[PDB]
Amino acid sequence: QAVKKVAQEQKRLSDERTKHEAFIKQSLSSMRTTEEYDFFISHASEDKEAFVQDLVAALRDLGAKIFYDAYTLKVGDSLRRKIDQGLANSKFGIVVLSEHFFSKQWPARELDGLTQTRILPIWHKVSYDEVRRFSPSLADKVALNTSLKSVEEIAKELHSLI
Amino acid sequence: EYDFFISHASEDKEAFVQDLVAALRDLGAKIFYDAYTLKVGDSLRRKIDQGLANSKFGIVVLSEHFFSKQWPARELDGLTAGQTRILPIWHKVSYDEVRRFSPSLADKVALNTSLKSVEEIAKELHSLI
């Protein structure tokens, strides 16, 4: 009888997951509907070899043009000026939201300013409470998750913007 | 008997487990966790079997520290199965890196701390009484 409630929870979790995938796909459709390069990707020094390499390896196979060596954050400058120089070069921009990213200690106003738009944040190995601590607004809104989709699926989803 | 039991790595007990146990105790549920913290040399399947006997439901928290303990593949793929009384919780872990250990566990949907808050996960767990 105890398993039945686990089944009910299972069904609820499944419906919620369905709604979430629908939401992000609907926002990307509105984003595409609304530059020499396709994407640029802002990340920390620690995430570069770990996740970013795999993502650009995934996107370049689909035929996307990216450059990630340029946009490594040293945590010594403004986030705004780093995302605007990339919007001048690329069609879209990606920010990898991780523990290494939040450890740089960025001004609240800039994180509040990260949120049609051409910028797409990707949650990588973070909890909701943790993101809510640095900026509750950034955590409240929707973004891509590495906990929900594989790197390859994420790459296809991004490629739908071009 | 107890309501839940929550197995976990020794590293996540102060970061997430203490918070969840606190939240679930604030909701009137009785759970125990210090007895079900696992060492690198353990049998996952037998440990959960001890857990389903002194409590009604079981919780496994899937984190980098949990996977750093190299469990057998058969014991992660067995978390899934058959009637199921166990509830996995994803905490700060990537999809692809779960696949490295168990694809069957990665395709199964579970509670995700990147989606809900600890208080929200607590309520959502309390719905099972």
Curated annotation (Swiss-Prot), chain B:
Function: Virulence factor that interferes with host Toll-like receptor 2 (TLR2) and TLR4 signaling, resulting in the reduction of dendritic cell maturation, inhibition of pro-inflammatory cytokine secretion and impaired NF-kappa-B activation in macrophages. Binds host lipids. Has NAD(+) hydrolase (NADase) activity, catalyzes cleavage of NAD(+) into ADP-D-ribose (ADPR) and nicotinamide, also generates a cyclization variant of cyclic ADPR (cADPR), termed v-cADPR (probably 2'cADPR).
Residue sites binding NAD(+) per the record: 9-10, 39
Domain TIR: 1-129
Organism whose genome encodes this protein: Brucella melitensis biotype 2 (strain ATCC 23457)
Gene: tcpB
Superkingdom, taxonomy of origin: Bacteria
Protein name: Probable 2' cyclic ADP-D-ribose synthase TcpB
Annotated domain remarks: The TIR domain mediates NAD(+) hydrolase (NADase) activity. The N-terminal region is required for localization to the host cell membrane.
Location within or outside the cell: Secreted; Host cell membrane
Subunit structure, interactors included: Homodimer. Interacts with host TIRAP, and probably host MYD88. Interacts with host TLR4, abolishes the interaction of host TIRAP with TLR4.
Active-site feature positions: 75
Lineage summary: Bacteria, Pseudomonadati, Pseudomonadota, Alphaproteobacteria, Hyphomicrobiales
